[PDB]
Amino acid sequence: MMLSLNNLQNIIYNPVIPFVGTIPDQLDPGTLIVIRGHVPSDADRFQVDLQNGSSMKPRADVAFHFNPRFKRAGCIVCNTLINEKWGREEITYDTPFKREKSFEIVIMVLKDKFQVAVNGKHTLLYGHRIGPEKIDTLGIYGKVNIHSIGFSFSSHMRLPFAARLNTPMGPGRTVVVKGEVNANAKSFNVDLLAGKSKDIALHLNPRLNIKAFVRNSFLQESWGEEERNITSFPFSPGMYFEMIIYCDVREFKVAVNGVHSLEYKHRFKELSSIDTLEINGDIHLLEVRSW
């Protein structure tokens, strides 16, 4: 598995092992935990435990025990601890982890199971044995060096919304946004910027109060000429919408609710440099997809 957008809520760097920390939000379905680190050359085993509390006597129940072990075969042992008792063991062989090799673990929470990919490859599924709402602490123990842990909750779409584009911008790349305009909305914005050069390749600014759709670029510390021509303002306060920003070789093509609205000749020519998406304004953000 791979993430199209980097928009993590909490981030922790270099926690000391053993590390036991409180999960900053509820693991509702769709929630992501990203763990980046590497295993030392002398690693016998390490484990990532999703727990209900952090008591050690009685040992706190472990809803999800993810335990990579290094041996001739190499595997990941998964299990659950309830009232200090382990349940049915589930072993996944052909382990993706290696001594002296770095790794990225993406744990996805679903309604009935955790889905786990390591280094961009599906690794294993583990059905919930404990309700996920009962999980409130992340424990990490053993021989492993953790660089960072990050999270993505249901709240990942609050405004302002800022997200890095793990896929560099280029012809054929699509960015769709779905949401609902606030009942008393004035305006909102969707910008595609080249994070580095502090430039805005594309500024999509629907202004509802004056009922116009402004698009422009902010280049070299200066706003350019605004483009407002349009067959009809597609937005209404309180209206559901989907907007498709399609990057083409000659321009950006944007549609709303299944209808082409406008084209925008590229002003920033280094497309591959457009690596940042920002959404703000008077809307309720429902979904953002980089493709």
Ligand SMILES: OC[C@H]1O[C@@H](O[C@H]2[C@H](O)[C@@H](O)[C@H](O)O[C@@H]2CO)[C@H](O)[C@@H](O)[C@H]1O
């Ligand atoms: O089941 C998870 C739990 O296993 C303990 O060790 C197991 C071991 O995995 C298995 O091969 C053997 O047959 O039984 C042992 C006793 O449960 C680990 O010590 C513990 O840390 C967890 O990984």
